[PDB]
């Protein structure tokens, strides 16, 4: 009898039979009895304490082991022929099946894969039968119990199937558990092995979200072990290890010993999955051994076991599907790891800025401290998906060159030599790269600068008529973007894939060459493809391996920042105790030591402290402090917050704290939030005191109700509003304590008046608790109950009112009813931002991803070089498929000819082939990027500035200036590579796969019937994939701001919410965010491990497929070993190609909107400014002209009649059409109910340019444009610099163009007219209407925005210059009214 690993025929011994299933019962055996018995009969007394009803699955499972154990007994009997191990292995299973019977009794995981292996161990022994049936006799040629045997696998088989599908149902009442039905529980919890391997568990999110879009209420509750809670704790405890041996590493040695028990089990298996890739193209090499050696075997016969290659192809589909489920485990184990370094961080560190020093959060700047969550937290997260490749890469490309020794033949490093040569080009024209990429970044700064400046003052230029030359500015802009954009992506698109394609290509043709050459011992198909198969494989890690040094660096550089953060010196708590509160009046609340001595000093003992005084405060009392800013008056206060590290002076304060800044602080959400903040409603407190402190204009003025949301986003609200808005918090919030910074500087002083009596007053709203108040106003220190006088840092006068009378006044004054504390909100959970609108958006319209939106794409594009570049991708291909089959064939050619090879000839040949192909590549990605690509976006460019600057003011005025403005930068940046570059990857990955599928079916006739369903199968998980995964993302981009925003504003008010003491709500906030953001962060992982397992198992199934389907050609007549051998490696590369096709296909789907949505802004309209088919002495005339929109009334039958050279004044009430009047004039509205005519001629006939262009207007404001002031005044050379130079000398500028503009007439003007005064800039604008030729002078609202001496020179230069020109203004003052020829008082509506 034989023995070995594997017999002659191909299959496992019978001893080893013996030995698999000896060590899988005795692994059984001892892990349940040591682990999972034990546990579960002690987790309560003598087994699990948990009701489950008795169903047909237990009995029925129950039933067929006992009926497996009989025929195993039945069996036994016939076993005892031969005296070997079996019956050891028979005594063993025959234990292992009397324990699993009572470990399937206890339970209602090592019963699953403990019967998975029994399964697969009887499966192997029946096959080792079967095949010795077909050496020897028909049926009982081992033993007859086969039959029984087969009953038996048929049995366990069953077992395992209805062990594993079925759930558990429970009867008595399992609905009571989902009371909280928000959000379900997660299934990853009750989630078998077999289960949680292939993600089965995901499908029912996936069809969820397929058939609908996703929502709150579909996403699962994260599972245990990944709330911020656990996750701090964890970190917190092994921080205080860091404290016993402190040290720079030791943040990531604790980081490392928290969470990387995870990562040793990602590592082995990352070790299984490299080390079954290596052995798949070993078993291709004894694949083709085995077939040659059989075509030799049939010859010498004929001169003169197909079953071998059919367990050959089962053991590729084995070592594929566990490849497959060891990567998706390692994968998951790896991202849960990332996971929890964020959870952990993002909330550590947001507990050590709340206790933070307020010191270093004044000397440090608060931006740095957000982008410590924003990026290097990221950065570690980053770091976490490739320290295993790290380790791995030296051990995967060893593993591969020990693999390319023993199998090409020794000393051959010619390849790796190439690749070496090869390697560090790339890493310069990565860094070539990302240097224009940032060139590129700063372009689009630019550009988004200059069209911010054209859109916010887009009523200037449509006013004023400069339009176009601006047009040309932009234009002329955008091409030196374009040109910048041809220089970088032509040149690094030429390089990149040409270089991707040469470096395998290269490396195969050198490699064989040096092998024909000086080896000897010609190839005969042996070597060749498993060769260019791990060609193929070493490519990917040693590229990988110096990019990812790099961010291991920048993320060493962040440890290094969050471990100064962390290991900043914080706070002392012991400064001043909260001490039990103080029931009666004039009882002692507030207490500092004799002596104190306060300080902000603690580093370098710097002498930012006071000295030696004391301070005292009882019950039911108003305190004052008086003195000048920088008098350590905030000081003093910052000692009674407890806030400072201080030196001497033992201080104790009783009862609860309220504290209002000097400068407010505002919560980021409603006004009805801010009022609450957090505590619970009451309605009549909450009404009174906003009577007491507010009024009903304070609600009122802002346009909206109380639930209006603060200018954080919201609507901005006055100091007044925020002083107010912050007493009413601290009224609302009445503690036992009260402290106030000095709010009543920014409220005028009669309404603060009443606010002193009102609020704090003697009779004020909470006169029955202490309440210490910051203040230099006199009226307040009058009435005030005690005095404190702080100058130089020292309270120099503490004495009640009384005796500061008696002494010589000139050092200051020459100069019942409890309400039940305030009650608390219970910390409850958090909803996520508004959907409304992109989830009306979505729902409007379904059935998107067709080939319309591509199709108007296309025809955007140029049709014609699409065609061309799909014919150089399909002849490249091509090119390249032709090279691999007659290499093929010169295989053959060499294996027929012993060792007499051409090779000079066919490598000739096949080097011509690579170039060819190459050149292809080559040309096709720089021509049509140069041709189809940039084309495209000029046309896309140019359409979006003609629509958007002609557009109406019911366009700009209604839609909001940032929403396109960001839509204009983001889009037009994002479509100019990233949707091209896409196009290009997805196009060349699907002529990849279908000329893969196209040489297999070739191969064999009958591929397309295993070919067809699998691609249905493939379409259907694309789809579901497709339609659910951006959504999923859509929500993990939408979680993000939130924690940002609530951190930035924490840092702002860290001050009040200390003092308020709602530091448990912060906290609990930010955490809830963190696990808001978590919930939408899961799901998307697992969803494109659910999609990658699935692609993967159809690219092990269609391997096994064509291996199967190629052994039974072989069997049915000839076939050459090349041709299998080609096919097997050409479909080796099917897996990864899917994986990312499906990604690509993503990525155009989601770059595709953007597009549609530039399309869409392209389609708008407004009628012709062409001159189609005019001043001075024109009579003008209106006759019945309304110009409005359609959805508002305003004029009414206007008619009038003006002779020329008169002055005219039109004055109205508010709201009585003063600009309508105006824009009438200009034709701005379109609609035209009558006529308005000039010069004999109706305004609507000649068109918008010229008739602007012929009339000088000042509209109300002095928005102005960016540049030099020449180009600003008179940007088309009308007529010299004298000109310019002379009216700005009327205009009296002269001032400013002598301060600046020294080398001459060049001055740079600042973005946004802030650089200067807005009297400057409307004498700018009145020297430019001057300076314009054109006689109709307007001015609107003239009198409201001037400071007296620029109403006098406006005025009496728009008297003495435009001698005989008709001019027109709306303005208020009566003497300017009354000069004016004729007065028309502009009506209500007529």
Not at 580 to 599: E, H, Y
Request: proline share 3%; hydrophobic share 45%; charged share 20%.
């Amino acid at each position: 009898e034989g023995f070995g690993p594997i017999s002659f025929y191909g299959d496992f011994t019978q001893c080893f039979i013996d030995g698999v299933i000896l060590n899988l019962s005795a692994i059984f055996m001892i892990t349940f009895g040591i682990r999972d018995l034990v546990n579960l009969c002690k987790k309560k007394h003598s087994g699990i304490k948990y009701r489950r009803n008795w169903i047909i699955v237990s009995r029925m499972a129950l039933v067929l082991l006992e009926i497996a154990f009989v025929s195993l007994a039945s069996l036994n009997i016939s076993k005892e022929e031969a005296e070997n191990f079996t019956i050891v292995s028979q005594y063993a299973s025959t234990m292992l099946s009397l324990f699993v019977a009572l470990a399937l009794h206890w339970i209602e995981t090592v019963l699953l894969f403990y019967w998975l292996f029994e399964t697969f161990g009887n499966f192997a022994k029946l096959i080792n039968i079967l095949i010795r049936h077909t050496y020897e006799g028909i049926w009982y040629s081992g033993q007859t119990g086969f039959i029984l045997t087969l009953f038996q696998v048929i049995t366990c088989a069953s077992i395992l199937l209805l062990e594993a599908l079925p759930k558990k149902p429970l009867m008595p009442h399992q609905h009571i558990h989902q009371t909280l039905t928000r959000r379900k529980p997660n299934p990853y919890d009750s989630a078998n092995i077999f289960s949680r391997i292939t993600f089965s568990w995901m499908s029912g999110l996936m069809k969820t979200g397929y058939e609908k879009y996703l929502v709150e209420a579909d996403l699962y509750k994260l599972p245990r072990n990944f709330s911020s809670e656990e996750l701090s704790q964890k970190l917190e405890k092994n921080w205080e290890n860091e404290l016993k041996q402190k040290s720079n590493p030791s943040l990531s040695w604790a980081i490392c010993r928290t969470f990387g028990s995870k990562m040793l089990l990602a590592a082995f298996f990352k070790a299984i999955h490299d080390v079954l890739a290596f052995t798949q193209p070993q078993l291709l090499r004894i694949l083709i051994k085995f077939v040659t050696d059989y075509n030799s075997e049939r010859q010498d016969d004929h001169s003169s076991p197909i079953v071998r290659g059919f367990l050959i192809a089962f053991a590729m589909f084995l070592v594929g599907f566990t490849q497959t489920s060891v990567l998706h485990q390692y994968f998951l184990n790896v991202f849960n790891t990332g996971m929890y370094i964020k959870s952990a961080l993002t909330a550590l560190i947001y507990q050590k800025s709340l206790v933070l020093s307020n010191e270093a959060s004044g000397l440090s700047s608060t931006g740095d401290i957000v982008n410590l969550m924003s990026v290097d937290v990221q950065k570690l997260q980053d770091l976490t998906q490739w320290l295993n490749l790290i380790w791995s890469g030296p051990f995967q490309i060893i593993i591969c060159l020990y693999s390319l020794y023993k199998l090409l033949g020794n000393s051959m490093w010619v390849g790796v030599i190439i690749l070496v040569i090869m390697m560090p080009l790339n890493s310069f024209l990565m860094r070539i790269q990302k240097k224009l990429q940032k060139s590129q970044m700063k372009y689009k700064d630019e550009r988004t600068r200059v069209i911010s400046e054209i859109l916010n003052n887009i009523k200037s230029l449509k006013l004023y008529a400069w339009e176009k030359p601006y047009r040309e500015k932009l234009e002329e802009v955008r091409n030196n973007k374009e040109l910048k954009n041809l220089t970088k992506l032509g040149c690094y698109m030429a390089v990149t894939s040409f270089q991707f394609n040469i470096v395998p290509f290269l490396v195969s043709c050198c490699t064989f060459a040096v092998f024909v050459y000086t080896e000897d011992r010609a190839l005969t198909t042996d070597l060749v493809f498993p060769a260019l198969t791990l060609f193929n494989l070493l490519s990917f890690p040693l590229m990988i391996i110096p990019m990812v040094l790099n961010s291991f660096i920048e993320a060493s550089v962040s440890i290094g920042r969050l471990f100064t953060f962390f290991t900043n010196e914080e706070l002392q708590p012991d400064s001043v105790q909260r001490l039990p509160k103080v029931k009666n009046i004039g009882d002692v609340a507030i207490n500092i030591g004799d002596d104190a001595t306060f300080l902000w000093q603690r580093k370098p003992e710097y002498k930012v402290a006071l000295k030696n005084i004391n301070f005292q405060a009882k019950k039911g009392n108003l305190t004052c402090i008086v003195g000048k800013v920088g008098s350590g008056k905030t000081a003093l206060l910052s000692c009674m917050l407890g806030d400072l590290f201080r030196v001497k002076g033992f201080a104790t304060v009783h009862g609860s704290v309220a504290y209002v800044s000097q400068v407010p602080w505002i919560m980021n959400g409603t006004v009805k939030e801010n009022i609450l903040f957090g505590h619970r409603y009451d309605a009549e407190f909450y009404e009174k005191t906003i009577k007491a402190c507010a009024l009903t204009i304070d609600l009122a003025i802002l346009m909206d109700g109380d639930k209006t949301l603060v200018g954080e986003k919201g609507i901005s609200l006055s100091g007044g509003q925020k002083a107010r808005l912050s007493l009413a918090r601290a009224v609302y919030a009445r503690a036992d304590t009260y402290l106030l910074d000095d709010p009543l500087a920014a409220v005028d002083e009669h309404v603060a008046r009443h606010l002193i009596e009102h609020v704090l007053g003697p009779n004020g709203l909470l006169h029955t608790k202490t309440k210490v108040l910051a203040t230099n106003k006199v009226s307040a220190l009058s009435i005030a109950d005690s005095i404190a006088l702080l100058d130089n840092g020292e309270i120099t006068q503490q004495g009640t009112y009384d005796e500061i009378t008696k002494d010589a006044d000139s050092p200051l004054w020459k100069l019942a009813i409890s309400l039940r504390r305030a009650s608390d909100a219970t910390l409850g959970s958090i909803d996520f931002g508004d959907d409304e609108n992109i989830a009306k958006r979505e729902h409007r319209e379904q059935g998107k991803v067709k080939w319309n939106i591509y199709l108007e794409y296309a025809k955007a594009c140029n049709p014609k070089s699409v065609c061309v570049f799909i014919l150089f991708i399909v002849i490249s291909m091509f090119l390249s498929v032709m090279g691999n089959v007659w290499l093929k064939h010169w295989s053959e050619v060499n294996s027929r000819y012993g060792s007499n090879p051409n090779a000079a000839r066919y490598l000739a040949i096949y080097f011509a082939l690579g170039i060819g192909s190459a050149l292809a590549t080559l040309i096709q990605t720089i021509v049509l990027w140069v041709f189809c690509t940039i084309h495209a976006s000029k046309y896309l460019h140019n359409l979006m500035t003609n629509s958007v600057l002609r557009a109406p003011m019911t366009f700009f005025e209604t839609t909001p200036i940032g929403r396109i403005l960001n839509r204009f930068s983001n889009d037009i940046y994002k479509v100019d590579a990233l949707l091209g570059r896409t196009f290009s990857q997805f196009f060349v990955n699907a002529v990849k796969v279908t000329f893969t599928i196209t040489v297999i079916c070739a191969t064999t006739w009958q591929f397309i019937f295993i070919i067809i369903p699998l691609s249905v199968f493939y379409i259907y998980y694309q789809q579901y994939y497709l339609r659910t995964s951006r959504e999923l993302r859509r929500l993990d981009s939408i979680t993000r701001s939130p924690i940002y925003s609530h951190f930035q504003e924490t840092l702002g008010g860290l001050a009040t919410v200390r003092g308020y003491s709602q530091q448990k709500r912060f906290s609990h906030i930010n955490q809830c965010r963190i696990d808001n953001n978590m919930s939408a962060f899961y799901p998307s992982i697992n969803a494109n491990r659910w999609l990658a397992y699935r692609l993967e198992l159809i690219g092990s199934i269609i391997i096994l497929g064509a291996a199967t389907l190629s052994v039974f050609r072989l069997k049915q007549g000839t076939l050459t070993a090349g041709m299998v051998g080609l096919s097997l490696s050409y479909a080796l590369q099917i897996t990864q190609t899917l994986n990312w096709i499906v990604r690509m296909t993503v990525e155009v789907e989601t770059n595709i909107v953007s597009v549609e949505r530039i399309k869409e802004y392209a389609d708008l309209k407004s009628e012709a400014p062409l001159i189609v088919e005019s001043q001075g002495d024109i009579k003008f005339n209106n006759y019945s002209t309304r110009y409005r929109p359609e959805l508002d009334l305003v004029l009414k039958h206007i008619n009038i009649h003006i002779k020329p050279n008169e002055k005219v004044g039109i004055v109205g009430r508010t709201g009585a059409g003063k600009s309508s009047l105006t824009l009438a004039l200009f034709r701005m509205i379109e609609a035209s109910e009558g006529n308005i005519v000039i010069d004999n001629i109706a305004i609507n006939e000649i068109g918008l340019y010229d008739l602007r262009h012929k009339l000088s207007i000042i509209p109300q404001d002095s928005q102005v444009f960016e540049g030099t002031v020449r180009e600003n005044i008179d940007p088309i050379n009308q007529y010299t610099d004298e000109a310019i130079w002379r009216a700005l000398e009327l205009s009296h500028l002269k001032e400013h163009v002598l301060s600046m503009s020294n080398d001459g007439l060049d001055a740079q003007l600042t973005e946004g007219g802030g650089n200067l005064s807005v009297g400057q800039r409307q004498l700018l604008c009145l020297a430019r209407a001057m300076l314009v030729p054109s006689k109709i002078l307007v001015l609107d609202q003239a009198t409201a925005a001037v400071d007296v001496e620029t109403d006098k020179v406006v005025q009496e230069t728009i008297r003495t210059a435009f001698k005989d020109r008709t001019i027109l203004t709306i303005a208020h003052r009566l003497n300017t009214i009354m000069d004016s020829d004729r007065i028309i008082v502009l009506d209500n509506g007529k």
